[model samples]
Target: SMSGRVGDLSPKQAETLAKFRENVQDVLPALPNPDDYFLLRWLRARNFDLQKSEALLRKYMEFRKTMDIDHILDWQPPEVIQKYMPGGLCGYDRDGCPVWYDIIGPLDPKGLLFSVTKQDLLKTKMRDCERILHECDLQTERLGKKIETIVMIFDCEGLGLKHFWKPLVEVYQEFFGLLEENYPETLKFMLIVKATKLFPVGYNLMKPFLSEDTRRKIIVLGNNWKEGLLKLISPEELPAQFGGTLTDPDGNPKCLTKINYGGEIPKSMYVRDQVKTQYEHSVQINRGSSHQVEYEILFPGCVLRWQFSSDGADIGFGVFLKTKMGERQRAGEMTEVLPSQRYNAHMVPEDGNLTCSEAGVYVLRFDNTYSFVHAKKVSFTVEVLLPDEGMQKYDKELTPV
Candidate 1:
């Protein structure tokens, strides 16, 4: 019944929070919002243990940088994820905690992986959780209490044999493992409903990866879970299909507006299958050597585009322009038009394009500079497209991962 403030902390825990503040005070000024609630969340996650909470706080900073957690709200997920992902924030529970729903009936795990990189899939989840955090912060303000709690309803009506498919299980375990480590105590409860007998088999696969603390909060109620929802969530917040009165603007009981019911993904959207014939050129570049391709663009309207992958290892890629007083091979001969980046393109293809601001020769460079022993076999296609063709692909090019 009680949330943040004195109500949530026992005396010893309050002491721990005070001590934790003293310990992390040096870096507090640098933190995004180093308030009592922010630091207190870490303490509670670590069970009021002073040392673990400080270490957890320090570790959280590193994880935030590694995952770009701070800037996540502005990041846009790939179109496929936006369209085919089958879950989203629905509404709030009775106490203002955010509620999210996952519609398992239409899930196609293998198709999703085939369409986009696994990290991108995980990124989408990160974005979702970030939005939940955003909602929690806003709720805290409106209610005058900390509300980091999240209520997740996993609708298992369509879960069946295919839900146990190997590819799906592999990713399921991974997502939980990462969340348990990096997002401890983020979820308050998980209610799985309409589950079949096979649900236990699938749940067992991901059980070990979940933290015991998290596992304890999960309730599986099979077909008789509608009453369970009414316990914590009021009838008004839930969709009509699940015994709640929530509906969409058009009066759809399922509330298809907020939750995307993923159907079988068309193979045409599978990037892996299409990659086989997508590129026009292939080459092997030895270690410490950089491969460069020059393209001439006579007009400013032309854009340089590329999609490439390296076999067996990562590769560095960037674009450089030969400045007019350039490429007689002098020191400042070329200006960096795009900063170089090393990518996991061996695992997932990397593609991006740049508009030419001036008519000049643009260089696409793939470097194996840091790899000492392995030569990277890169399959790539480089082209210069006129304004109209580039404009049609305008949105796709803006997506980085």
Candidate 2:
């Protein structure tokens, strides 16, 4: 039958896949074969909604073309990925989803970017996704059941200030966009383990980009992550670092190699002749207090940039603008900053660029008001650059609502 069983798919699901191929085949010109399995993937991705599945497939194919993903999938994994990457497909969970582990804490973004271009890293991710999908296909065929999703464990034990540098953060943003647009519903669960106090700061920055469905699958476990993970995956399936017995493919107990958290890169890898900040300042904000650094922009199109780090505790940073003289003199009138771009010094370096929308006195405020006991010692470098064509060339495009 055209709707023959393709796994553990229900008869309705099988028919849905058949109908999806028949409906969307003409629209997907680049997709040579609109096979049942291929249709099933998109069908399940959007929960059997033929319209959404067709739309996603068209967009996915366009993404593949724009990114030239076929060439990227052929590219070899670089040495940096082989030696420094702290992740692998260690085993399968109880639900038969591949258990992928990533030790995010020890990653050095600077080292990785220095070693390879952003394009190279993105291509590597694409290659990894293609391989994982192939694995999913093999698993489905073997078990006669659908296997489209993977269980991820993000271990954040040593994550620190260097992870959130501007260039690195941009790369991460693009990576998330790639996954959300092309690989919807591919994550069964993202188990964040060994999360520190700083984790929320980074997590919040990336949260808005994720879909509601994707966000619902997230499970953040504190230090006692093993207990939570055990409920979803057997101890034997977990790696040794996570308090589980490792075993060989033959079912014999085997000792596994320690995971590499790619420690800080050597100073030699520093980008050549990068200028250090000459006008940096360090200030202390008492617990339950706030401090403001005001910069007046005399003209529009100027850029405001800042790099800041916290010495010990976390502090929230925000920008409030007084666009009108009357508004400036008024008592207690300040606009809260961008909803997601608000900065937080949570063990990581924080930096951002804001192009002034109008001539005004912008107040950059660091708030420690949330801390009940511990005072935060903050160090920051702020620059208000005059309008330059080079700045205009690189400024992120502002989208109008």
Tell me the lDDT of candidate 1.
0.74
Across residues 1-401, which tens digit of lDDT does each residue of candidate 2 receive?
23223656777887777778778757667653446656776776677888898898889888888777667656787777667766666677887787777778778776777666677667767777776776777787888788878887888776544555556666667777788888876888988777643454456456657777778888777546677888888888776568677655544442234345566666565443222333388887888777767877776655577878775556777777776443233224766453223355644577766656678788887777656566777788887645434223322321121
TM-score of 2: 0.63
lDDT of 1 by residue, 263-369 (tens): 88888888774233357898889897788788776766444667787767678888887744245332145778887888877666776666676877787888787
Clash-forming residue pairs, model 2: 161-348
C-alpha lDDT values of all predictions: 0.74, 0.67
lDDT of 2 at 76: 83
- For candidate 2, the 10 contiguous residues with the lowest summed lDDT are 392-401
- True-vs-predicted CA distance for residue 243, candidate 1, Å: 1.3
Quantify how close model 2 is to the true structure by its C-alpha RMSD in Å: 13.6
